[PDB]
C-alpha cells in the first residue's frame, strides 16, 4: 500500500521520508510480492528498522566488519565492561531457575528439612529448630573391584529433641564425608522414635538387652546422678533427653552396634508404670514421689 506523505510523516523520522518517497515512486502499487522459500532475508518478526536496538544491532562506534565509521573515528575508548549488556530484564535465567546469589548460607539441616517435608510431610520448623544432630561414627570403607579399590565414607549420626524423640541415621557417599553426614542426618530424622522416660530423666528400672554381639546392662539412676555410661550411649542419651543413667557394655563394644542396640533397648525393653498397671490391673505407686506430695 502507498501512503500519503502526511501519514508517513507522523510515524517515521524526517531523515527516512525521502527513502520512502523514492520507494513509492519506483515500486508500482500493483506489485505482487512473492515469498522466498530459499533465502530468508528479513527477520522472523516485524520491524520497521527505524530505531537501533542497543543489543540486537551493532553498537554505534564499535569496530566490526560492517562498521561505517573511518578507522580513526571510533568512539569506544573504555574496555573494562561488556559493551552490549543483555536486552530486556538483563538476564536469561531459565523459567523455574533461581539466581545462586547466596551460597554457604545453605544449611544441611535446612536442606534436610525441606527435602523431608516434601517427601514425608514432616514440619521443617521442628527439624531446623528443635533437633540436635551428633555424629557417632565417621570412617572410610572400601570395596575391592576389578578396576581397583573404591573408597566410601560411612557416617552414623543420632538426632533428637532432648525431650523423648530420638532417631538414628546412616549414610554412605563415595564423594565426601559431608555428603555421608547429610544422608545420615536425613535418615536419622526419618527414623525418629519416642522413648519412654521415667520422670523425663531416666529409664524405667534396669535393662539387660542383647543386640547381636553387644551385651547392654543399663541401670536407672537417682536425680542428679548424671550419665555414667559408654561414650556412644552418652551421646544418644543427650539427644533423647536422658539425664541420669548407669551401665556397662560386655562382649562386643562396636560403636555402630552399641548405638543401634541402645535405641532398640530403649523401646523394646522398657515398660511404663502405666502400661504395667493396666496389664496387671494393679496400682503402682512411686514411693519417693508420694513422700513429697501434699
Amino acid at each position: 500500500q502507498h501512503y500519503d506523505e502526511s501519514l508517513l510523516s507522523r510515524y517515521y523520522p524526517e531523515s527516512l521520508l525521502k527513502s520512502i518517497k523514492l520507494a513509492q515512486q519506483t515500486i508500482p502499487e500493483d506489485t505482487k510480492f512473492r515469498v522466498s522459500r530459499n533465502v530468508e532475508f528479513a527477520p522472523p518478526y516485524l520491524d520497521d528498522f527505524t530505531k537501533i536496538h542497543p543489543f540486537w544491532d551493532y553498537k554505534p562506534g564499535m569496530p566490526h566488519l560492517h562498521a561505517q565509521e573511518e578507522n580513526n573515528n571510533f568512539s569506544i575508548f573504555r574496555w573494562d565492561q561488556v559493551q552490549q549488556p543483555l536486552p530486556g530484564e538483563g538476564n536469561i535465567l531459565p523459567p523455574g531457575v533461581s539466581l545462586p546469589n547466596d551460597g554457604g548460607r545453605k544449611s544441611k539441616s535446612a536442606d534436610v528439612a525441606a527435602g523431608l517435608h516434601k517427601q514425608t510431610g514432616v514440619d521443617p520448623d521442628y527439624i531446623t529448630r528443635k533437633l540436635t544432630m551428633k555424629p557417632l561414627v565417621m570412617k572410610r570403607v572400601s570395596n575391592q573391584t576389578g578396576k581397583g579399590k573404591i573408597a566410601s565414607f560411612y557416617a552414623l549420626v543420632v538426632v533428637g529433641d532432648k525431650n523423648g524423640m530420638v532417631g538414628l541415621g546412616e549414610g554412605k557417599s563415595r564423594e565426601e564425608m559431608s555428603k555421608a553426614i547429610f544422608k545420615a542426618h536425613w535418615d536419622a530424622v526419618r527414623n525418629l522414635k519416642e522413648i519412654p522416660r521415667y520422670e523425663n530423666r531416666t529409664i524405667y528400672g534396669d535393662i539387660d538387652f542383647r543386640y547381636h554381639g553387644v551385651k547392654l546392662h543399663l541401670r536407672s539412676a537417682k536425680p542428679g546422678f548424671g550419665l555414667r555410661v559408654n561414650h556412644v550411649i552418652f551421646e544418644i542419651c543427650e539427644c533423647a533427653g536422658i539425664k541420669d543413667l548407669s551401665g556397662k557394655v560386655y562382649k562386643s563394644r562396636n560403636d555402630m552396634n552399641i548405638a543401634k542396640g541402645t535405641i532398640e533397648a530403649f523401646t523394646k525393653a522398657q515398660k511404663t508404670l502405666d502400661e504395667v498397671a493396666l496389664g496387671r490391673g494393679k496400682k503402682l505407686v512411686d514411693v519417693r514421689k508420694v513422700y513429697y506430695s501434699s
Partner: protein, 66 residues
C-alpha cells in the same frame, strides 16, 4: 468411584509411598472444596511436589502385596 477414592489394579510400584517424589511427583494434583468440586485454583509448584499420602489403604490380596 462411589467413595471418591483411588484404586490400583495393575501393579504396586515398590516405593510408591516411601519414594513418592521419584514416582508420583510428576502427576497432577488439584484443590477441592468441601463438596469435592474442583476449586480451579492454580497450584504453586511447591504444592504440586509435596507427597500426597493415602489416609487409608485397602488391600484385596495382601499375600501378593507385601
Amino acid at each position: 468411584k462411589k467413595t471418591h477414592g483411588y484404586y490400583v489394579s495393575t501393579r504396586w510400584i515398590p516405593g510408591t509411598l516411601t519414594n513418592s517424589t521419584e514416582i508420583s511427583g510428576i502427576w497432577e494434583k488439584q484443590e477441592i472444596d468441601s463438596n469435592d468440586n474442583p476449586t480451579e485454583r492454580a497450584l504453586s509448584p511447591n504444592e504440586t511436589s509435596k507427597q500426597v499420602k493415602p489416609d487409608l489403604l485397602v488391600v484385596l490380596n495382601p499375600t501378593e502385596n507385601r
